[PDB]
Scaffold this active site. Structure first.
Site, PDB file in Angstrom:
ATOM      1  N   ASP A 150      -9.410   8.455   2.802  1.00 40.98           N
ATOM      2  CA  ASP A 150      -8.901   7.730   1.669  1.00 40.98           C
ATOM      3  C   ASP A 150      -9.826   6.585   1.360  1.00 40.98           C
ATOM      4  O   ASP A 150      -9.344   5.514   1.008  1.00 40.98           O
ATOM      5  CB  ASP A 150      -7.524   7.166   1.967  1.00 40.98           C
ATOM      6  N   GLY A 161       0.709  -1.275   0.000  1.00 35.15           N
ATOM      7  CA  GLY A 161       0.000   0.000   0.000  1.00 35.15           C
ATOM      8  C   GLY A 161       0.743   1.336   0.000  1.00 35.15           C
ATOM      9  O   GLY A 161       0.273   2.333  -0.533  1.00 35.15           O
TER      10      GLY A 161
HETATM   11  O1  LIG Z   1      -4.937  -5.153  -1.251  1.00 35.68           O
HETATM   12  N1  LIG Z   1      -4.678  -5.681   0.058  1.00 35.68           N
HETATM   13  O2  LIG Z   1      -3.927  -4.853   0.975  1.00 35.68           O
HETATM   14  C1  LIG Z   1      -5.192  -6.877   0.397  1.00 35.68           C
HETATM   15  C2  LIG Z   1      -5.711  -7.706  -0.597  1.00 35.68           C
HETATM   16  C3  LIG Z   1      -6.303  -8.925  -0.286  1.00 35.68           C
HETATM   17  C4  LIG Z   1      -6.330  -9.325   1.045  1.00 35.68           C
HETATM   18  C5  LIG Z   1      -5.790  -8.540   2.067  1.00 35.68           C
HETATM   19  N2  LIG Z   1      -5.809  -8.987   3.334  1.00 35.68           N
HETATM   20  C6  LIG Z   1      -5.536  -8.246   4.412  1.00 35.68           C
HETATM   21  N3  LIG Z   1      -5.758  -8.750   5.643  1.00 35.68           N
HETATM   22  C7  LIG Z   1      -5.521  -8.004   6.715  1.00 35.68           C
HETATM   23  C8  LIG Z   1      -5.064  -6.685   6.642  1.00 35.68           C
HETATM   24  C9  LIG Z   1      -4.883  -6.187   5.354  1.00 35.68           C
HETATM   25  C10 LIG Z   1      -4.381  -4.901   5.194  1.00 35.68           C
HETATM   26  C11 LIG Z   1      -4.301  -4.102   6.324  1.00 35.68           C
HETATM   27  C12 LIG Z   1      -3.788  -2.820   6.192  1.00 35.68           C
HETATM   28  C13 LIG Z   1      -3.266  -2.391   4.972  1.00 35.68           C
HETATM   29  C14 LIG Z   1      -3.334  -3.198   3.848  1.00 35.68           C
HETATM   30  C15 LIG Z   1      -2.691  -2.714   2.551  1.00 35.68           C
HETATM   31  N4  LIG Z   1      -3.613  -1.934   1.729  1.00 35.68           N
HETATM   32  C16 LIG Z   1      -4.913  -2.211   1.609  1.00 35.68           C
HETATM   33  N5  LIG Z   1      -5.364  -1.310   0.742  1.00 35.68           N
HETATM   34  C17 LIG Z   1      -4.320  -0.556   0.375  1.00 35.68           C
HETATM   35  N6  LIG Z   1      -3.240  -0.990   1.026  1.00 35.68           N
HETATM   36  C18 LIG Z   1      -3.870  -4.470   3.972  1.00 35.68           C
HETATM   37  N7  LIG Z   1      -5.101  -6.976   4.281  1.00 35.68           N
HETATM   38  C19 LIG Z   1      -5.256  -7.300   1.727  1.00 35.68           C
END
Ligand SMILES: O=[N+]([O-])c1cccc(/N=C2/N=CCC(c3cccc(Cn4cncn4)c3)=N2)c1
EC number: 2.7.11.22
Lengths: 296, 258
Positions: free
Chosen positions: A127, A13
């Site tokens: 966001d 992210g």
């Molecule tokens: O796109 N992801 O970050 C993503 C895709 C598919 C499954 C995912 N699974 C989790 N599970 C727990 C926490 C988590 C997460 C927590 C905080 C930040 C992010 C990263 N992120 C999520 N959107 C943008 N950045 C993921 N993702 C995350």
């Protein structure tokens, strides 16, 4: 970190890659955010300094739970509970058919309760966007990614150089007030709802100005009747082309009258009239909400 | 959108209790004293003035410092370091983007290495267990300010000023919750500019009768009375500027009607 077994990367992210990973002692599955810890340049990043302190107070079902921070010398690890997908992905994987009405009015409901909690804890997300909404196979859906969130104990001043995203960004910011409000979270949610409805981004601009203009093309350009203030907003111009407000049922055909009423309050131009999360949850459209699971 | 104000207000209040420092703590620091702390803070005010930081960033940093002091012994030698670290965090949390560490380091006349300032931010975090979202008097004033009839920015300035003032002296002011000082401040400032008083609104919102305010009032009025002899001055010089309507120039009033 002794007791984690990294299982596979599932995203970046913002200062960090996210792994799927499993705690070798409890067997619990988790999502690890690994942070780039340069102990010579910058120290702990300001996102991670938000995300953590914020999430650490928000505890609640449609906010992603933050389980633990492993703070080594060179490494910072954020352990999140674990969710399998994101709404962006879902919707992609699912356009052609579209996300089922029911699933949608469930999601929006839950996001409202998440957000509704956020605001009432003086906390702004800024966001909102399908990539930052995670779902699980029980038909839950959870605000996530708080690197941009700010506490608003005091009002939150705008970035002139918004590193913020298009697509889901309130017109009041695009005309450049020097503050955010609760409202912007809602505006985003608004649009997400739309998109979820119609399998395409409601307002896909290509620039700050294309974006204004797409909105104006849909909501129609605003006046002082509709939005006392406008004409005197830093980015405002009597230059602007007059578009004419469009029938919503043009934009969101599939939506029934109740839906559209809710949408059109969500997308109100005047931050001061735009409905709140609290209040939306009380809207009629929610009446027969349930809890379908995704086809995941 | 008064749909949250209340919820929030109330949350501030509950928070503001948890995230509070230890009244009696300067006393257990074997090598530092109230005075030294005043030094440090005035010093921050200034540094804040130079990097055009918001006032909240300041409030935050002190908060951090107090809490941090509140469980760590630290030698006269370390403390400014502790300051900086707090100042850095605080900005980080608070500001749209902070100063870069290097600046932070430079404003101490290269006395600590950029590394140690890093090794510090992290220690602070560790000690306040990332609990950074602390309630400040500023946070309080700001809600408070909503209930002015009409508004009037002298008051506002005056209050902030008061406000900041108390940042300086653990002395008395550690004894007092951020929301009280707030009160005190607002009403001191109110009185002072308008000769009006702490609005029933606010007594109703806060449950603070004007009476309850009274002990923290006495202290604050004194501080204000002496402000100009204070050993530290950065704060005055700051509210001297037009951006604040030189509020701080303008005269304390000599008695409180109490
Ligand atoms: O796109 N992801 O970050 C993503 C895709 C598919 C499954 C995912 N699974 C989790 N599970 C727990 C926490 C988590 C997460 C927590 C905080 C930040 C992010 C990263 N992120 C999520 N959107 C943008 N950045 C993921 N993702 C995350």
């Amino acid at each position: 970190m002794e007791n984690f077994q990294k299982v596979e990367k599932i995203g970046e992210g913002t200062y960090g890659v996210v792994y799927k990973a499993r705690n070798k002692l409890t067997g619990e599955v988790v999502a690890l955010k690994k942070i780039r810890l340069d102990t010579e340049t910058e120290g702990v990043p300001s996102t991670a300094i938000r995300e953590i302190s914020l999430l650490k107070e928000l505890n609640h079902p449609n906010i992603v739970k933050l389980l633990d921070v492993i703070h080594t010398e060179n490494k910072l690890y954020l352990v999140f509970e674990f969710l399998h997908q994101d709404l962006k992905k879902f919707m992609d994987a699912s356009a052609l058919t579209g996300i089922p009405l029911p699933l949608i009015k469930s999601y929006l409901f839950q996001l409202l309760q998440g957000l509704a909690f956020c605001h009432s804890h003086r906390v702004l997300h800024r966001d909102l966007k399908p990539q930052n909404l995670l779902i699980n196979t029980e038909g839950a859906i959870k605000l996530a990614d708080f690197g941009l969130a700010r506490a608003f104990g005091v009002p939150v001043r705008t970035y002139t150089h918004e590193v913020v995203t298009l697509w889901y960004r309130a017109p009041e910011i695009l005309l450049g007030c020097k503050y955010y409000s609760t409202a912007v979270d809602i505006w985003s949610l608004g649009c997400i709802f739309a998109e979820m409805v119609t399998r395409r981004a409601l307002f896909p601009g290509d620039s700050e100005i294309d974006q204004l203009f797409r909105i104006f093309r849909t909501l129609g350009t605003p006046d002082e009747v509709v939005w006392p203030g406008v004409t005197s907003m830093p980015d405002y111009k009597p230059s602007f082309p007059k578009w004419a407000r469009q029938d919503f049922s043009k934009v969101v055909p599939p939506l029934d009258e109740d839906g559209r009423s809710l949408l059109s309050q969500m997308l109100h131009y005047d931050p001061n009239k735009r409905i709140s999360a609290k209040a939306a949850l009380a809207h009629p459209f929610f009446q027969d909400v349930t809890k379908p699971v995704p086809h995941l | 959108v008064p749909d949250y104000h209340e919820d929030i207000h109330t949350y501030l209040r509950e928070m503001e209790v948890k995230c509070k420092p230890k009244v009696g703590y300067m006393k257990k620091q074997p090598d530092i004293t109230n005075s030294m702390r005043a030094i440090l803070v005035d010093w921050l005010v200034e540094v804040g003035e130079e990097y055009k930081l918001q006032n909240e960033t300041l409030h935050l940093a002190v908060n951090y410092i107090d809490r941090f002091l509140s469980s760590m012994s630290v030698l006269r030698g370390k403390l400014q370091l502790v300051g900086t670290a707090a100042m850095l965090l605080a900005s980080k949390f608070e500001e749209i983007y902070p100063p870069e560490v290097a600046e932070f380091v430079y404003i101490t006349d290269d006395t600590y290495t950029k590394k140690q300032v890093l090794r510090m931010e992290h220690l602070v975090l560790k000690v306040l267990t990332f609990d950074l979202a602390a309630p400040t008097v500023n946070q309080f004033l700001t809600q408070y300010f909503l209930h002015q009839q009409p508004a009037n920015c002298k008051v506002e300035s005056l209050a902030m000023f008061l406000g900041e003032l108390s940042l300086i002296d653990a002395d008395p002011y550690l004894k007092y919750l951020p929301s009280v000082i707030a009160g005190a401040a607002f009403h001191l400032a109110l009185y002072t500019v308008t000769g009006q008083s702490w609005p029933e609104s606010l007594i109703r919102k806060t449950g603070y009768t004007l009476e309850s305010l009274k002990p923290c009032l006495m202290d604050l009025h004194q501080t204000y009375l002496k402000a100009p002899q204070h050993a530290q001055q950065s704060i005055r010089e700051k509210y001297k500027n037009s951006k604040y309507h030189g509020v701080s120039l303008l005269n304390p009033p000599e008695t409180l009607n109490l």
